Design an enzyme around this catalytic site. Structure first.
Site, PDB file in Angstrom:
ATOM      1  N   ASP A   7       0.861  -1.187   0.000  1.00  0.00           N
ATOM      2  CA  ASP A   7       0.000   0.000   0.000  1.00  0.00           C
ATOM      3  C   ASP A   7       0.898   1.237   0.000  1.00  0.00           C
ATOM      4  O   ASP A   7       2.060   1.156   0.408  1.00  0.00           O
ATOM      5  CB  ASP A   7      -0.867  -0.004   1.255  1.00  0.00           C
ATOM      6  CG  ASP A   7      -1.613   1.280   1.461  1.00  0.00           C
ATOM      7  OD1 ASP A   7      -2.385   1.695   0.575  1.00  0.00           O
ATOM      8  OD2 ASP A   7      -1.465   1.853   2.561  1.00  0.00           O
ATOM      9  N   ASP A   9      -0.249   4.995   0.857  1.00  0.00           N
ATOM     10  CA  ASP A   9      -0.527   6.017   1.874  1.00  0.00           C
ATOM     11  C   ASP A   9      -0.461   5.454   3.295  1.00  0.00           C
ATOM     12  O   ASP A   9      -1.233   4.557   3.658  1.00  0.00           O
ATOM     13  CB  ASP A   9      -1.889   6.664   1.607  1.00  0.00           C
ATOM     14  CG  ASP A   9      -1.872   7.583   0.397  1.00  0.00           C
ATOM     15  OD1 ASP A   9      -0.829   8.233   0.163  1.00  0.00           O
ATOM     16  OD2 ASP A   9      -2.900   7.661  -0.326  1.00  0.00           O
TER      17      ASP A   9
HETATM   18 MG   LIG Z   1      -2.772   3.105   3.487  1.00  0.00          MG
END
Ligand SMILES: [Mg+2]
Ligand SMILES: O=P(O)(O)O[C@H]1O[C@H](CO)[C@@H](O)[C@H](O)[C@@H]1O
Ligand SMILES: O=P(O)(O)O[C@H]1O[C@H](CO)[C@@H](O)[C@H](O)[C@@H]1O
Ligand SMILES: [Mg+2]
Ligand SMILES: [Mg+2]
Ligand SMILES: [Mg+2]
Lengths: 246, 246
Positions: A7, A9
């Site tokens: 991922d 962010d």
């Molecule tokens: Mg995230």
């Protein structure tokens, strides 16, 4: 043959911001032992901006999956896109669109602008104020939305109307919510990865609890799942697993 | 102190295409006697693309008026914008927006996409199919629109609903129509030009008959009006007026 899949962010970068050079440097070091990839709900341009200058991201990572993997770069090469209209069919898609237009026509806000419905690769983004609002207008809407639960009520009505028809909703943004086909969460990227002969796919994310946008890909039997709280945590975890001796 | 002010499409270039190097060369020659400017309904990026590489357009012309002059470059410098919401007020603007959302919710088309309402500097652009359609989808809608008069009927309903409220409509595009405040036709640019001490402003356009997008600026007492049929005609006219001896 190992892939580390991240991922973006809160996992590699501060949310929606540029990566820390130290974290970036570690990822390239990790790359001497495994292939590395990113998957994010944001569009390619956004992810590219966070992870390097220009299009460096597709050189720095073996895989770049944007819009949850509906857009894929594999070793610097853009793969073809499956479109939402192809998946949903034109009738359901237009039923959705017209329901949203009808609903929003009846909403009265302090300000409205344009781009109430943004047709993306992996979702339709629905914004009651309109995406073309300014920063101050954006903050104004966000504050109103918290008071009136505008997006929440809209999503309730949509979920009920399209019950059983394979649509999912997320209020990840501030001025909008996204509508996407079931399975077009981050797991989408795993079907392409299935074909690339990895012994192991490690997934790292910071929203791995139920309701989080990493939950499904984390929990999927095709990945070894890792929950992290920051990019520093992600780095520590990677050093522990892939550089145990160091 | 003379300004030659030109419409772009069909006046300096083939409609929506790059300018002919010969025409471009003549305009710079003309520039040795007068200041030169362009005014177009298209956005800056489009006009820039037609009139040079990169941002050369703002160097090649003394004035670049995009979106009928709601966006202005004066001698390479971007001037501040007056916004449509400031001019119309938020209530009328949202009345317009909601009427359009409501109307379109009830339209059933072969395909719908996104960006049904594009909030620009000088207009709101309204597209029943959505601006994010492909080329083939665009052609499909255009053909249907001719058969069903979709945009024409929509504009009739809008004109009636907002009768007396200062809104104008044009079906210049293929998949859309534009909604703009009265006076935000090409004449808009003339108010800024009024302040720049020109003895004479010559305007050249290829749509100078009633109903044409050059009519108002052509007929305005502030301009000497010239009707042309092509960029070659525009050049001939300019040679005749400003290089009579040659
Ligand atoms: Mg995230
Ligand atoms: O409504 P917001 O706050 O602009 O967020 C939404 O749009 C962003 C930009 O496309 C996306 O990056 C977000 O994920 C979300 O879809
Ligand atoms: O609907 P169409 O054919 O794309 O045309 C409309 O949009 C164009 C691009 O912004 C504008 O350049 C046109 O003037 C018009 O507003
Ligand atoms: Mg798993
Ligand atoms: Mg013209
Ligand atoms: Mg005149």
């Amino acid at each position: 043959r190992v892939l580390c899949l991240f991922d973006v962010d809160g996992t590699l970068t501060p949310a929606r911001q540029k990566i820390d050079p130290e974290v970036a440097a570690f990822l390239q070091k990790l790359r001497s032992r495994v292939q590395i990839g990113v998957v994010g709900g944001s569009d390619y341009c956004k992810i590219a901006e966070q992870l390097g200058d220009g299009d460096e991201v597709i050189e720095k990572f073996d895989y770049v999956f944007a819009e949850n993997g509906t857009v894929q770069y594999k070793h610097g090469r853009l793969l073809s896109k499956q479109t939402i209209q192809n998946h949903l069919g034109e009738e359901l898609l237009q039923d959705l669109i017209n329901f949203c237009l009808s609903y929003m026509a009846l909403l009265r806000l302090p300000k409205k602008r344009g781009t109430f419905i943004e047709f993306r690769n992996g979702m339709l983004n629905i914004s009651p104020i309109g995406r073309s609002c300014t920063l101050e207008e954006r903050i104004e809407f966000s504050e109103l939305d918290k008071k009136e639960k505008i997006r929440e009520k809209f999503v309730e009505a949509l979920k009920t109307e399209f019950a059983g028809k394979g649509l999912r909703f997320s209020r990840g943004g501030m001025i909008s919510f996204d509508v996407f086909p079931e399975g077009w969460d981050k797991r989408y990227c795993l079907d392409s990865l299935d074909q690339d002969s990895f012994d192991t796919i490690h997934f790292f994310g910071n929203e791995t609890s139920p309701g989080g946008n990493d939950f499904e890909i984390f929990a999927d039997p095709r990945t070894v799942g890792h929950s992290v709280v920051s990019p520093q945590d992600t780095v520590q975890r990677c050093r522990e697993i892939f550089f145990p001796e160091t």
